[PDB]
Design a protein around this ligand. Structure first.
Ligand SMILES: CCCCCCCCCCCCCC(=O)CSCCNC(=O)CCNC(=O)[C@H](O)C(C)(C)COP(=O)(O)OP(=O)(O)OC[C@H]1O[C@@H](n2cnc3c(N)ncnc32)[C@H](O)[C@@H]1OP(=O)(O)O
Ligand SMILES: CCOC(=O)c1cnc2ccc(OCc3ccc(N4CCNCC4)nc3)cc2c1SCCC#N
Ligand SMILES: [Cl-]
Ligand SMILES: [Mg+2]
Length: 385
């Protein structure tokens, strides 16, 4: 493929490979005073719209758009189904700009048909921390694909980001663009296998009967780390230390403030779960996973897949293996059907012993306007929504 849009932009060409020692922007010495002050032109009968995520009604309009039009797997079994409460948590982190939540409406009908979002975060690439935008939730309605709207959405958000004197961005995708800094396979751990078979995702055979399948994915309902409990406000400082120390070994990761810690980890029902082990008034271990349901497309009996996604996990009092077994138990106790993770951080090493299956695709990590060595997913220490 040609990448007629992406080749205009400050990213790598497909054939670009840089040494471990090159770690700089593609275009340095940018200035806010030169950024375009006009909005990008939309085609006839479309308008830019500014979304207020904190208003139930606008938030529901985005929710409606994502429900019907977001990413489907290759085999169209599933469609991501971010909840309304989820979008509120993901779009209102500390210092979020309301102007970085960009909608597009069809004038004749007043209906949202397009969306792109960004929030600010500090990012450490190969030991240099940089102010960045994190881009998420790009979506064009199904009736309007392959009409070159995506680039308008990207250029527009780029423009508004540049106005805040920010010139770098991090994003993830299932698709291949120029060019990933890392590529990680996902892995699934069955919890309610009976459902995973009935919808057609998982398969039986003459060796693995229905009952043998259930027997194999059974977990013991007793935690290895006895005192593991839900995070509370008094745990923010201890979470900040533990996680700030652990993350420093990776090639790519976000630098968290106390404020971001409380925002990203304080538990919220059906959104984000965090557990901690506290001895001596000190936080020595933590487990976290987020809820991302999927719509199960065209199925008589089931409409929703309840899925937990591995977030950040750190142990100092047990093995990583034991910690994640406790994560899987904690997922099961909250009615999740499946536990998903990427081969990032220490995760790869436990997939075989804990009975994870290799999934069908992979998640690519990209930076905008950053030149650097690509690296294996073990060196990736950030998880994005
Ligand atoms: C300094 C600040 C920097 C800020 C900016 C940073 C960049 C952030 C970038 C955003 C990161 C998103 C992160 C994120 O949200 C997480 S990845 C999930 C994105 N969402 C979906 O997949 C939802 C369902 N699909 C859609 O809505 C459409 O397929 C979309 C709208 C994706 C494309 O609409 P369309 O109707 O299918 O296509 P056209 O309008 O005709 O446009 C075709 C052009 O779109 C390029 N394309 C396709 N998919 C892309 C993707 N996932 N990322 C980036 N680019 C993508 C494609 O390569 C082609 O360019 P080319 O001709 O060069 O090949
Ligand atoms: C039973 C186990 O399977 C699942 O839980 C599930 C649910 N909904 C999806 C919806 C779309 C999909 O397409 C491939 C894909 C496409 C993009 C993507 N991203 C992009 C950026 N944001 C989140 C992850 N992740 C996966 C796969 C899926 C999958 S499996 C593949 C990846 C995951 N999780
Ligand atoms: Cl227990
Ligand atoms: Mg289009």
């Amino acid at each position: 493929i040609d990448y007629k849009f992406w080749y205009t932009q400050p990213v790598p060409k497909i054939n670009d490979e840089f040494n471990e020692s090159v770690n700089e922007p593609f275009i340095s010495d940018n200035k806010v005073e030169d950024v375009r002050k006009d909005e990008y032109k939309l085609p006839p009968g479309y308008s830019w719209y500014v979304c207020d995520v904190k208003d139930e009604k606008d938030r529901s309009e985005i929710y409606t758009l994502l429900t019907d039009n977001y990413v489907e797997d290759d085999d169209n079994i599933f469609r991501f189904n971010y909840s309304a409460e989820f979008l509120l948590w993901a779009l209102t982190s500390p210092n979020y700009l309301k102007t970085w939540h960009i909608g597009v409406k069809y004038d004749a009908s007043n209906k949202l048909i397009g969306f792109i979002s960004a929030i600010p975060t500090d990012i450490c690439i190969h030991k240099r921390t940089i102010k960045m935008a994190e881009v998420n939730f790009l979506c064009v309605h199904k009736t309007l694909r392959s009409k070159r709207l995506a680039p308008v959405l990207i250029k527009e958000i780029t423009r508004r980001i540049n106005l805040e004197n920010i010139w770098q961005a991090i994003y993830t995708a299932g698709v291949y663009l120029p060019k990933p800094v890392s590529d990680a396979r996902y892995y699934h751990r069955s919890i309610n296998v009976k459902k995973l078979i009935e919808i057609g995702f998982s398969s039986l055979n003459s060796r693995l009967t229905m009952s043998r399948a259930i027997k194999l994915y059974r977990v013991e309902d007793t935690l290895n780390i006895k005192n593991m409990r839900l995070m509370k406000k008094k745990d923010v400082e201890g979470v900040h230390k533990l996680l700030g120390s652990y993350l420093e070994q990776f090639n790519l990761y976000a630098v968290f403030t106390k404020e971001e810690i409380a925002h990203w980890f304080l538990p919220i029902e059906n959104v984000i779960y965090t557990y901690v082990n506290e001895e001596n008034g000190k936080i020595k271990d933590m487990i976290s996973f987020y809820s991302l349901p999927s719509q199960i497309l065209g199925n008589d009996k089931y409409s929703t897949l309840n899925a937990a996604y591995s977030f950040y996990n750190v142990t100092t009092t047990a093995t990583f293996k034991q910690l994640m077994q406790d994560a899987i138990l904690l997922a099961k106790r909250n009615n999740f059907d499946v536990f998903n993770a990427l081969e990032v951080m220490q995760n790869k090493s436990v997939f075989e012993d804990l009975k994870f299956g290799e999934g069908d695709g992979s998640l690519k990590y990209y930076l905008y306007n950053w030149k650097c060595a690509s690296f294996a997913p073990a060196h990736v220490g950030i998880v994005l929504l």
